[PDB]
A paper describes a structure:
In this work, we employed an approach to disentangle noncovalent and hydrogen-bonding electric field changes during the reaction cascade of a multidomain protein, i.e., the phytochrome Agp2. Agp2 originates from Agrobacterium fabrum and carries a biliverdin (BV) chromophore. Phytochromes harbor a methine-bridged tetrapyrrole chromophore as a light-sensing unit, which upon light absorption undergoes a photoisomerization at the terminal methine bridge followed by a cascade of structural relaxations.18−21 This reaction sequence interconverts the parent states Pr and Pfr and involves proton translocation, which has been shown to be a prerequisite for the functional secondary structure transition of the tongue, a phytochrome-specific peptide segment. In the present work, we have generated two further variants with ortho-cyanophenylalanine (oCNF) at positions 165 or 192.
We determined the crystal structures of the Pfr state of Y165oCNF and F192oCNF variants with 1.90 and 2.06 Å resolution, respectively. For Y165oCNF, the residues Phe167 and Leu274 are slightly shifted away from the nearby oCNF165 by 0.9 and 0.8 Å, respectively, due to the larger space occupied by oCNF compared to the native Tyr165. Despite this minor difference, the BV chromophore structure remained unaffected by the Y165oCNF substitution, showing nearly perfect alignment with the WT Agp2-PCM. The region between 1500 and 1700 cm–1 is dominated by the C=C stretching modes of the methine bridges between pyrrole rings, which are particularly sensitive toward geometrical changes of the tetrapyrrole skeleton.54 In the Pfr state, a nearly perfect agreement between the WT and F192oCNF spectra in this region underpins the preservation of the chromophore structure in both proteins. This conclusion is largely valid also for Y165oCNF, although the stretching of the C–D methine bridge (C–D) displays a 4 cm–1 upshift, which suggests a slightly larger dihedral angle and thus stronger torsion of ring D than in the WT. Minor differences that do not affect the functional integrity include a slightly higher torsion of ring D and an increased keto content in the Pr state of Y165oCNF and the reaction kinetics. Interactions of the nitrile group in Y165oCNF seem to be more variable because the ortho position of the CN label allows for different, possibly coexisting rotamers. Our crystal structure of Y165oCNF in the Pfr state shows that H-bonding differs from that of the WT Agp2-PCM, as the nitrile group is pointing away from the potential H-bonding donors propC and H278 and no H-bonds are found except for a hydrogen bridge of the Y165oCNF backbone. Again, this finding is qualitatively in line with the nitrile stretching frequencies that are in each substate of Y165oCNF distinctly lower than in the Y165pCNF variant. In Y165oCNF, EF,tot remains largely constant within the accuracy of the field calculations, whereas in Y165pCNF, we note two extraordinarily high values in Lumi-F and Pr.
Numbering used by the authors:
A (entry chain B): 6 to 53, 55 to 79, 86 to 97, 99 to 229, 232 to 503
B (entry chain A): 7 to 80, 86 to 95, 97 to 119, 127 to 503
The structure:
């Protein structure tokens, strides 16, 4: 009946009963024969009496309904459609056996293909994920004219990290900030996956009711670009000073990688033709990112194999493998991202970088021995496995253990610091936010504080690539040990 | 003069002629002056006299030269339905070797073709349907795909044809049937057009300029065809062709080859659609090929992990391998596998005889540095291997020890033994002056001779799977000693 902080995790944001006022909406039966529903502003916007029950040809003219019926062969995006009286940008789709027609007054626009080609040409030569992600916020802001453009990337736990930002010089920075998974509820994530673009013209605009809200059953606006916005998010945006937004969904391995989020501090909406271009840019961006990400993964795997092969050849001419490992173990830190590495062999410890103290190591080795079946064991939350590890979480909150034997509890141990310790936040800790009725929950400062609490005593998770490199290292050492036993 | 003795280095990029389905003007780098023109420019464009030493503005007019200069500030630019006298020409424009080349032909599809391949979810399904679709859409008598082999031979892997034509499906041609300069131009250009294999070539005037420079037609679509290739097509009864280059990992994977038994050239708009289809085909093939490779590697890892878990509760690893070795044949394509341990042989499928294994095991022990050793030409390494080439022409050897010459051996048959050729051995061909050489029958016979006593090469993927198997066995052996 009324959304608040206790139920916003389940708000039915796909059936709000309202649209935003920058266009009007007509809902027809699946044949587009009769008008079933309309937004209240259809009269004003299109120049029409009482719309429900009239035929589509009566309301819109036979010529337009004919062209629209043809188009029904993603919603169809049809700029500069000639109405019976003027030009309208029309979005047309069928869902839940309902035809939804969305109208915006047409302006003067370039062909979307040409706008998109200009943008795509300025990222297509990026040859690292870093270079693509940093340039894209600057390019999008320059092309679309928003006050702020950010990219955020979803973390393994569903949190967002802001990884790129272009902004007006007077704004606060969010670069290197995180927000908790709960800042974007599951239904919003489902709709970001389904729709390339999400448009908010005015976070404080009066909603326009869909007549009727409930029929003789609510209207499913999942694919309607005019669909109204959650009061919770509108309040969040108002607290930030944001009045408008457009997000471009980033799809990698068929899932929602993150968003290109465009924010404006005054009501703002892009023409349909520029939105078509943005959608084409989004598709290209996603594919180029996926290709760069794959090449980065391949290069990091090949780097590890090259290093471990050098180690195999080195060890072949060494009578004392323990001594070689005591002299060499620091070099293994270069296989994967870590803040420390150590060697635990025959109840003797050797450490490099950020590691637990020497006295803490026996408890860690005993735990891994009990917990693993002679393969790699890794956690990003040590205190959860070993309460005692809380004391040294600042230095080492995460551990990946590579067994050196199936008959002795000897390990190569990799460590990561508590994630808050490696923050590179460009933001202003003295920047404060106004609130509304829901209070300070709906502010970036509180979002960030909630995130910090969700990852307290935790490190950056060990990725599938980190685990693949650990397995390669485990195997290379089995091989060093076996050939050593063969030849001695 | 080209013949079979020098066609391997024919300078086909500077032939001094064009095909008759358009005309060509060569200007300086700034498109100021006409330097060369095809002899048919007068007839096609309604121009009189020697065009050389006339300004581009004179010959083309102020509007066209302005438009072409603008197109130049941007692959060759394709400008369909340009206004000349108010006539319409499809214009191709490019710059190469400080020369502007302008090509003229008297004057939707891509989305429809791409939509019919985009849902293919195997390389087999994509390449099977593509010949059918291209034939139906572009209206050629035959459409084939061939894929280049590691030695540069072509294998015909897909075919759509008129029911009255002979089949080339499963046929190979040797690397020499496509010379190195032809391969370079197939890599550089998405499309290669032959409007008429019996068309009279049109000279470029002059062929060699006052400075002694030929005109480099590397990027010109009207570039004329080697007399060697025209004779080959005339022997087949082919009169016209268009190829779409297939690019995988930035290299020439093969061609989509469209053949017509009468003259044929597609309009520039349809060619632009075919090029867009070719780019999509290449990217979709690359994606499907990667997926197949990943699935094959993961399949091998899953099997080897099952072998590792199985081995952990076995006291006698030699016995488990004697009982299990035949399953290792499922890791990579092979016709046979066997286990050579403590000088005892266990074989499955097509292998050399019992008597032959010591010599092979001896050779690998001497040849390898304790890692995987593989050849597809056993007789080259070991002359007496010729005797059993029919059964086993290729061998991949996985060491089971660095102190004992114990091996897991994989074998492949002589490649001619695994042939699946759909052609007619009684179909014969007319020949011209160069003779028998320029016929599909002779090309196939030459290929067979180049691969005699050889198997299918062990791929980079086969070798990665062999390395995984070598390592899994090291792990079995080590954990066994750890607990025994
Ligand atoms: C219980 C429900 C809540 C909720 C719902 C919604 N959030 C939606 C969008 C959204 N929210 C944010 C969060 C931010 N946290 C920050 O710290 C921060 C900036 C510093 C932001 C912007 C983000 C990032 C987004 C994504 C859109 C964008 O990036 O612009 C949302 C959907 C809105 C829509 O219909 O378009 C809903 C619903 N937000 C909460 O905080 C809670 C409590
Ligand atoms: C010494 C030079 C030779 C030579 C030159 C050229 N070949 C070119 C193209 C070409 N040749 C073939 C060969 C085939 N072998 C078959 O068995 C067979 C059919 C069953 C064919 C068609 C192929 C496949 C091609 C590629 C084009 C296509 O697939 O249609 C060539 C380039 C021509 C150009 O400029 O377009 C040159 C030059 N061919 C020889 O046989 C030798 C001796
Ligand atoms: Cl507005
Ligand atoms: Cl990434």
């Amino acid at each position: 009946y009324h959304v608040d902080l206790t139920n916003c995790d389940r708000e039915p944001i796909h059936i709000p009963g309202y649209i935003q006022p920058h266009g009007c909406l007509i809902a027809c039966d699946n044949a587009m024969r009769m008008v079933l529903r309309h937004s209240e502003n259809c009269g004003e916007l299109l120049g029409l009496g009482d719309l429900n029950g009239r035929t589509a040809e009566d309301v819109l003219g036979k010529k337009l309904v004919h062209d629209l019926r043809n188009a029904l062969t993603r919603p169809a995006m049809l700029p500069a459609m000639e109405t019976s009286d003027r030009s309208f940008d029309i979005s047309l789709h069928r869902y839940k056996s309902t035809t939804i027609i969305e109208f915006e007054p047409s302006g003067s626009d370039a062909q979307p293909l040409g706008t998109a080609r200009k943008m795509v040409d300025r990222i297509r030569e990026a040859d690292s994920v870093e270079s693509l992600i940093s340039r894209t916020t600057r390019l999008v802001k320059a092309t679309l004219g928003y006050d702020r453009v950010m990219i955020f990337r979803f973390q393994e736990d569903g949190a967002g990290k802001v990884v790129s930002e272009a902004k007006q010089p007077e704004l606060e920075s969010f670069l290197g900030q995180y927000f908790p998974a709960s800042d974007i509820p599951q239904q919003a994530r489902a709709l970001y996956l389904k729709n390339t673009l999400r448009i908010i013209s005015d976070a404080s605009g009066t909603r326009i009711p869909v007549l009727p809200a409930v029929d003789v059953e609510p209207l499913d606006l999942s694919y309607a670009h005019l669909r109204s916005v959650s009061p919770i998010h509108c309040e969040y945006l108002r607290n930030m000073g944001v009045a408008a937004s457009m997000s471009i969904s980033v799809i990698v391995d068929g899932a929602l990688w993150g968003l290109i989020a465009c924010h404006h501090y005054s009501p703002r909406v892009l023409s349909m033709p520029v939105r078509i271009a943005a959608e084409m840019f989004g598709e290209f961006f996603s594919m180029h990112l996926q290709v760069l990400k794959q090449k980065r993964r391949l290069d990091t795997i090949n780097h590890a194999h090259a290093a471990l092969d050098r180690f195999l050849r080195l060890a072949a001419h060494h009578a004392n493998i323990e001594e070689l490992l005591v002299d060499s173990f620091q070099d293994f830190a270069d296989l994967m991202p870590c803040d420390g590495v150590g060697l635990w062999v025959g109840n003797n410890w050797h450490g490099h970088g950020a590691t637990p103290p020497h006295d803490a190591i026996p408890r860690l080795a005993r735990f891994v021995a009990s917990a693993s079946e002679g393969r790699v064991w890794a956690t990003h939350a040590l205190s959860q496995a070993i309460p005692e590890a809380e004391i040294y979480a600042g230095t080492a909150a995460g551990m990946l253990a590579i067994p050196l034997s199936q008959v002795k509890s000897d390990y190569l141990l990799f460590f990561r610091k508590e994630i808050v310790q490696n923050l590179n936040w460009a933001g202003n800790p003295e920047k404060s936010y106004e609130t509304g009725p829901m209070g300070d929950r709906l502010t970036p400062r509180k979002s960030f504080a909630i995130w910090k609490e969700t990852v307290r005593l935790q490190a950056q998770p060990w990725s599938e690539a980190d685990r693949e490199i650990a397995e390669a290292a485990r195997i290379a050492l089995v091989e060093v040990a076996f050939h050593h036993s063969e030849h001695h």
